[PDB]
Amino acid sequence: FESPRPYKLTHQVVCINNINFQRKSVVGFVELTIFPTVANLNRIKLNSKQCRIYRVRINDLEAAFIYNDPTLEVCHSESKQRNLNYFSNAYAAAVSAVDPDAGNGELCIKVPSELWKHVDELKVLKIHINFSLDQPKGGLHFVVPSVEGSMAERGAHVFSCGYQNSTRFWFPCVDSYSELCTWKLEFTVDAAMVAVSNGDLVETVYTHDMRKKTFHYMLTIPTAASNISLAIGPFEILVDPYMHEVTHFCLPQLLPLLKHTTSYLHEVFEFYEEILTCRYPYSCFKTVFIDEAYVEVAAYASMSIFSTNLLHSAMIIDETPLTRRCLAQSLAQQFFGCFISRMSWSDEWVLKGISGYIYGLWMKKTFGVNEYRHWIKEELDKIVAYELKTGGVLLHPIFGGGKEKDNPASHLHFSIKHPHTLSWEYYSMFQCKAHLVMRLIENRISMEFMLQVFNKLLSLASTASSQKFQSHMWSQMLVSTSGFLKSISNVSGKDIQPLIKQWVDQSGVVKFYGSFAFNRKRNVLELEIKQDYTSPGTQKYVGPLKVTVQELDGSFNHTLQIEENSLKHDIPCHSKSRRNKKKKIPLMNGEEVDMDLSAMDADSPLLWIRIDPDMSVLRKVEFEQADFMWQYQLRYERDVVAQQESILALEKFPTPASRLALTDILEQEQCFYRVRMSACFCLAKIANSMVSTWTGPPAMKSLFTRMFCCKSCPNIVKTNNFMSFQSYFLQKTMPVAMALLRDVHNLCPKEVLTFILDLIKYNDNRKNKFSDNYYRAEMIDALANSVTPAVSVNNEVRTLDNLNPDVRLILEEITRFLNMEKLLPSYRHTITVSCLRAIRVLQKNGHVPSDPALFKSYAEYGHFVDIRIAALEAVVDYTKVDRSYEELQWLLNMIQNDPVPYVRHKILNMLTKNPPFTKNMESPLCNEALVDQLWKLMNSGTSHDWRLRCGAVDLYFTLFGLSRPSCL
């Protein structure tokens, strides 16, 4: 109920002064307003890192001073136990001790006996601390254009990126979450450079009248410390026109892009208060764009601060989802980074649950309810793939309190009490399970009741906010798991604690061997199918659910399930669907019109198997039907789910030409976009199975024929084929799958080759108003998917043929586009990115030799992120297959040394996804000194951020996980 944390707190004041751009430092004094809890509260602890304190003071009494950093290495630097398990446990205990959620110490000012007798008298104090941030080496950012003479004035900006509890790394506070306070914030700014934080513009004129300005932001609304952040330098645009108080801040010469970008935001606020039945529970909303991100999402109080990649300025169609997509997260988590708030790290999951689910609800009623369902399927893709890579993603209420473990999910690392142990794979899947468990709460409970719950939540919170600080009666904004659950059951008490102990408290994905049987195959037994499952490693047994079956033209048959899963079950039987030449359509689903006796229709009154098409249980369903039923489901079904899963099932085995026919038929209607993209890849696989069975044509050329008439298109489709965004994605996708079409003589896509080169010829002028950009990019990736591994039979790597022949043509085109985007550049060098992937795939077939120095020259500093990020993916696979020790050393040195966080994040992420030096396959000899430097980088050089050494934990997970590395 209450915090086990003493010394309640009310108010705090910051005052940044003397912010430097040359030695690049910040000075400031903080004051704190504390009601202590018990006497002898002497060694008062706050916490920070990378903070040289200048002085401490309580009421003109500089009291004592304790300053440790056990967030640094092991107490002995050569603790030879250099494996995972000891380090994980030791680091877990270490940073748990760093947390003040116990009697601890990082900043323990000791109360003097004078002030202790005052505590005996009055437990009300003020705390004044002078301190100075240095060059911030893991807490802040000073984005500086490398000019330093004049453009250091106009061209730089300054802010704070960081994770959840990175307020420590900025200015000293508590365990930064779950301490309800209010703030007055004093900001020493340039008169031009505008600084934006939480709260309100409460006191600012041309301030202090000397040379600069100084801002007062007061947040009266009672929040916690991990919401506070200050972006200094941009330009103001109120992008108000519909809702009058919506505030935006961007770097100069980026401004009118916001004029396209920012809008649709009003519609989102309209949506959110259609949900919540409040107002936007604040004064205003503030948004900062920045060339960097520790995290792309980042969302704080009244303010979302995130990257300048999401502008999508009016012509750049493919960020039509993405921009407002991410804007949705930067509102929803906003509210639950506002008000609802975790009582512990082990209490959060409801927060990200309801936040992500709410913007899922947004994605329903904004665009693509079928793309909504598609998004859910990708969620299951991420979750199933990760918890079959790894162990579970569990949502504890449970501690290992008393030095206990209780962690089967310690397949790598700690989770229970701590954010800063986890992987981004883990933290991402945490959010993904959060979405889907809220969908299960839909599955047991009305959406209207969800509105009821959330309105009660925010009513109690906004009531408990904005007052005189009701003393001892204020922490109702900690709305964590237990009382939330209680409020759910107060709205409707159902058996949702089984829902918890299934999904919240048994992190297991469930496959399904629901084995198809066929009764009423003129069978005495009638319409029966068996239930089956067992598959450990990561299994889970979920029993009582139901089953969704479509008849021929009839009932959605739904059938119960049980535990003790060696089961056989029936179907609520269809009629005697006989004389079905006469029973043409006895009402399939509404007025749908279909006739085929093409299936095994002597005695097949069935059409389709399903378990829970609304995707209730975390599933990976394995079964078998007649292939007719799969293909006919692809003739039509009312689920994108069903359509792409029959897409996968028919990507496995078959090749009739009727399959090809029904595929193409599916591609030419109004059905769905991405359905057709995976249908293209169906044609790719099945026409690759057409080597001896080349029965159909050179495929899909006819699809560009019969679907595309510019001016009836006399044999070639060229021009202006946009504004119909079905066709946009479809033309963007199809030639890639055409470049896959290969039959084994030399895999010979020669017609397709020359055809795609012709596609690259016939590109449009400014008649297309839509910046003919990504179309180029995926035509280039089709050329990258012209993978020709087997030209160099003996030695042909080395300028020998000026290697030949069509490879050279592909080289001509990619050389052209690289120099065009060096000259034109169109939008993020996205073309250049696809080019770099293409050039690496050319090295992976030995045509341009395996040399990294190009990619090395695109991993450099002064390029874009995305260029640099793709070069790093490339050189990671280079060091994977080729055995370059030296560039690996370079890579790790740059993991140490570069200013950008997000490259370090993605280096370590896809380094771990795509490893060299793979465990117990050690030919390139990590044991020599590489384990040593890696152990160092786990210990040293990585106190900048948590997640960098979390990635290093992932490195030692993959590379030599649960053991000595076979050194000594």
Partner: peptide, 22 residues
């Protein structure tokens, strides 16, 4: 220098004002 002389990298100071400019 004959067949494929790709331009090397510039890298310059401010990438975003360039790559995000219609």
């Amino acid at each position: 220098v004959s067949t494929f002389p790709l331009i090397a990298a510039r890298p310059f100071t401010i990438p975003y004002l360039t790559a995000l400019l219609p």
